[PDB]
Design a protein around this ligand. Structure first.
Ligand SMILES: CC(=O)N[C@@H]1[C@@H](O)[C@H](O)[C@@H](CO)O[C@@H]1O
Ligand SMILES: [Cl-]
Ligand SMILES: [Cl-]
Ligand SMILES: [Cl-]
Ligand SMILES: [Cl-]
Ligand code: NA
Length: 129
């Protein structure tokens, strides 16, 4: 599923991501934009053998199990495939654990490099929220 911008903002808000850990909804939509281009089926293989999954590109080294990242953890206690669903519940619940881990949204390199310190409210401008 390729979400629309305002559609994803609504779904993220319904799942309680807006202002979670102090991050406004615009930060989360911006992160998803540059992590996945709003595509729940996005995947990216990393040099260390891990894989990033889903609309927020959550990594198998720490957060989900894909059976092919030797020595990894599964802190969100989910198969990584669950992170590719058109329903974003699993991704949101796992993003809540990730953003609570100590470094906030700097856990998403694309957020730090492309969203942090920008006018992130622009990503929810004009949405019926
Ligand atoms: C939360 C999450 O999956 N973060 C990843 C991190 O593993 C890494 O720095 C890179 C991998 O492509 O992009 C993302 O920031
Ligand atoms: Cl915002
Ligand atoms: Cl594994
Ligand atoms: Cl959803
Ligand atoms: Cl923080
Ligand atoms: Na894992």
């Amino acid at each position: 599923k390729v979400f629309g911008r305002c559609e994803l903002a609504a779904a993220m808000k319904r799942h309680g991501l807006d202002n979670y850990r102090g991050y406004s909804l615009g930060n989360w939509v911006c992160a998803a934009k540059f992590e996945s281009n709003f595509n729940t089926q996005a995947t990216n293989r990393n040099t260390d053998g891990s894989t990033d999954y889903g609309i927020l590109q959550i990594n198998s080294r720490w957060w989900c199990n894909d059976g092919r990242t030797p020595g990894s953890r599964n802190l969100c206690n989910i198969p990584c495939s669950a992170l590719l669903s058109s329903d974003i519940t699993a991704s949101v619940n796992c993003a809540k654990k990730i953003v609570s881990d100590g470094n906030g949204m700097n856990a998403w390199v694309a957020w730090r490099n492309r969203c942090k310190g920008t006018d992130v409210q622009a990503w929810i401008r004009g949405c019926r929220l």
